[PDB]
Each structure stands twice: as structure tokens, then as C-alpha cells.
Scaffold this active site. Sequence first.
Site, PDB file in Angstrom:
ATOM      1  CG  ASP A   1      19.889  16.284   6.698  1.00 44.94           C
ATOM      2  OD1 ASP A   1      20.037  15.478   7.758  1.00 44.94           O
ATOM      3  OD2 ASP A   1      19.259  14.353   6.344  1.00 44.94           O
ATOM      4  CB  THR A   2      21.001  20.083  11.155  1.00 43.24           C
ATOM      5  OG1 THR A   2      20.220  18.801  11.612  1.00 43.24           O
ATOM      6  CG2 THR A   2      21.403  21.512  11.026  1.00 43.24           C
ATOM      7  N   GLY A   3      21.488  16.303  10.665  1.00 47.16           N
ATOM      8  CA  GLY A   3      22.543  15.187  10.566  1.00 47.16           C
ATOM      9  C   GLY A   3      23.111  14.557   9.465  1.00 47.16           C
TER      10      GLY A   3
HETATM   11  C1  LIG Z   1      22.350  10.665  11.241  1.00 50.51           C
HETATM   12  C2  LIG Z   1      22.040   9.777  10.597  1.00 50.51           C
HETATM   13  C3  LIG Z   1      23.000   8.077  10.522  1.00 50.51           C
HETATM   14  C4  LIG Z   1      21.249   9.929   9.249  1.00 50.51           C
HETATM   15  N1  LIG Z   1      21.220  10.187   8.999  1.00 50.51           N
HETATM   16  C5  LIG Z   1      20.597  11.966   7.905  1.00 50.51           C
HETATM   17  C6  LIG Z   1      19.229  11.575   8.286  1.00 50.51           C
HETATM   18  O1  LIG Z   1      19.060  13.618   8.090  1.00 50.51           O
HETATM   19  C7  LIG Z   1      18.132  10.793   6.955  1.00 50.51           C
HETATM   20  C8  LIG Z   1      18.257  12.103   6.028  1.00 50.51           C
HETATM   21  C9  LIG Z   1      17.175  11.055   4.569  1.00 50.51           C
HETATM   22  C10 LIG Z   1      15.786  11.785   4.900  1.00 50.51           C
HETATM   23  C11 LIG Z   1      14.625  10.413   4.331  1.00 50.51           C
HETATM   24  C12 LIG Z   1      15.090   9.551   3.520  1.00 50.51           C
HETATM   25  C13 LIG Z   1      16.722   8.886   3.303  1.00 50.51           C
HETATM   26  C14 LIG Z   1      17.048  10.265   4.207  1.00 50.51           C
HETATM   27  N2  LIG Z   1      17.033  10.777   7.873  1.00 50.51           N
HETATM   28  C15 LIG Z   1      16.616   9.499   8.062  1.00 50.51           C
HETATM   29  O2  LIG Z   1      17.195   8.600   8.356  1.00 50.51           O
HETATM   30  O3  LIG Z   1      15.620   9.680   8.319  1.00 50.51           O
HETATM   31  C16 LIG Z   1      14.533   8.602   9.146  1.00 50.51           C
HETATM   32  C17 LIG Z   1      14.429   8.531  10.380  1.00 50.51           C
HETATM   33  C18 LIG Z   1      13.524   9.523  10.881  1.00 50.51           C
HETATM   34  O4  LIG Z   1      12.145   9.512   9.302  1.00 50.51           O
HETATM   35  C19 LIG Z   1      12.506   8.757   8.660  1.00 50.51           C
HETATM   36  S1  LIG Z   1      21.364   9.876   6.349  1.00 50.51           S
HETATM   37  O5  LIG Z   1      20.974  10.453   5.791  1.00 50.51           O
HETATM   38  O6  LIG Z   1      21.707   8.104   6.343  1.00 50.51           O
HETATM   39  C20 LIG Z   1      23.445  10.787   5.983  1.00 50.51           C
HETATM   40  C21 LIG Z   1      24.337   9.754   6.510  1.00 50.51           C
HETATM   41  C22 LIG Z   1      25.189  10.405   6.272  1.00 50.51           C
HETATM   42  C23 LIG Z   1      25.644  11.902   4.917  1.00 50.51           C
HETATM   43  N3  LIG Z   1      26.965  12.082   4.588  1.00 50.51           N
HETATM   44  C24 LIG Z   1      24.182  11.920   4.084  1.00 50.51           C
HETATM   45  C25 LIG Z   1      23.050  11.552   5.129  1.00 50.51           C
END
Ligand SMILES: CC(C)CN(C[C@@H](O)[C@H](Cc1ccccc1)NC(=O)O[C@H]1CCOC1)S(=O)(=O)c1ccc(N)cc1
Lengths: 99, 99
Positions: free
Chosen positions: A25-27
Site C-alpha cells: 500500500d503506497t498510500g
Molecule cells: C490515504 C488514506 C487516508 C487511506 N489509507 C490507505 C489506503 O490505501 C486504504 C487501504 C485499505 C484497503 C481496503 C480496506 C481498508 C484499508 N484504502 C482505502 O481506504 O480504500 C478504499 C478507498 C477506495 O477503495 C476502497 S489507510 O488505510 O487509512 C491508512 C492510513 C494510515 C496508515 N498508517 C495505514 C493505513
Amino acid sequence: PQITLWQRPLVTIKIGGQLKEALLDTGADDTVLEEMSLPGRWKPKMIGGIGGFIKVRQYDQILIEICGHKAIGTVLVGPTPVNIIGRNLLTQIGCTLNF
Amino acid sequence: PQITLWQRPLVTIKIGGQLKEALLDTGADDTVLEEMSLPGRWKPKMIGGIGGFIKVRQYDQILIEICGHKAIGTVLVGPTPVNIIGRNLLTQIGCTLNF
Ligand SMILES: CC(C)CN(C[C@@H](O)[C@H](Cc1ccccc1)NC(=O)O[C@H]1CCOC1)S(=O)(=O)c1ccc(N)cc1
């Protein structure tokens, strides 16, 4: 290796004697893993993302073997839908984005 | 271009005549942008992230320019904390992971 994004970039990791699959995960700034049996002391931290915030337990100096490559770093364990490998570990294995 | 991950991988995007910065997110299946002015009809939809579920508006066939790369696809507009370009658009500009 080289990974295209037509499918979720899942990779096999080994942490604390257990085998799990994780999302490159790059984000994600930090690495956050689903609830698991990990030894050592931890610190109660809190992170936010889409949908809100979660209480997470922070363990430092955890060795993780990601696709054969070893790395030591901070790992957050808590209420995550998917195991996430963030940039704190992605930089240690030499992972880059290309286009 | 080749993007190393010591800093958040942010890029300049042009959407709906507006310029914004977005994060390249391999962990996101879809593109989620902060609430903004966008012409057209949309469908309601809910997204599941790390902290919970948000309700967003779905726009199909929307033109977006990431760097000099033009791509058309589905964009979800809603209460996300960071604009994120997910795998639905990353595959179009030919982005890959390598390590
Ligand atoms: C840029 C941010 C706000 C979003 N994050 C990264 C994203 O890659 C995150 C990864 C993920 C995938 C599926 C379920 C749960 C999490 N995908 C996400 O939200 O997917 C949604 C948006 C569209 O499709 C589904 S995070 O998970 O909150 C995060 C924040 C901080 C840390 N330290 C670790 C993780």
C-alpha cells in the site's frame, strides 16, 4: 519483482512465526496488521483513514519477511479490514512506483 | 517517472477544470476525491476504509489528467481526508510496483 495493478498487489509475509498475506500500500504511511499473536511490549496509538479512526497497538523493532526480503520496523496491530504494508517498510525493501 | 517512497507519492491532477494534488494509492481499488464541484449525474455509493464506511457520489466516464497522462474512468467524490488515485486509474497511466 514487478507488479501490475490489474489485481490487488498481495504478497506473502512472515511475522512472529506466522504466514499472512498483505497488501502493498503506497498510500499507507505505516504498516497495520490485523489482530494477531505478537510478543513484546506495545504502546496504545491511534490512526485515521477513510471512514474514521482506530485504536491500534504499536510494536517497534518487529522483523517481517516480505517476499523473502527481511525488514525490521514498527508494526501497528488492530481493527484493519486488510493487512497493510505501508511506506515505512516499503522503503526498506526498495519498492518504487513507475509510470 | 520513477517515484521512491520516502515521501508520500503525491501528483498534480486536473479534473473538472480544477487543479488538485492526489496520492497514488496502490491499496485503494477506486479513486476517491474530496468533495468538489463536478457536473453530471451521479449514483450514491458507500466505501469501506480503515475506520469505517463513508457514503460517496459516483461519477462515471470522468476525464482526469494525472501528470500528462489523460485517463477516463469512475471517480467517487466524498468525505475522504486525502484525494487518492486508486487501481482503476493507476492501470490506465501504466503504473507498476517494483522491488
Ligand atoms: C490515504 C488514506 C487516508 C487511506 N489509507 C490507505 C489506503 O490505501 C486504504 C487501504 C485499505 C484497503 C481496503 C480496506 C481498508 C484499508 N484504502 C482505502 O481506504 O480504500 C478504499 C478507498 C477506495 O477503495 C476502497 S489507510 O488505510 O487509512 C491508512 C492510513 C494510515 C496508515 N498508517 C495505514 C493505513
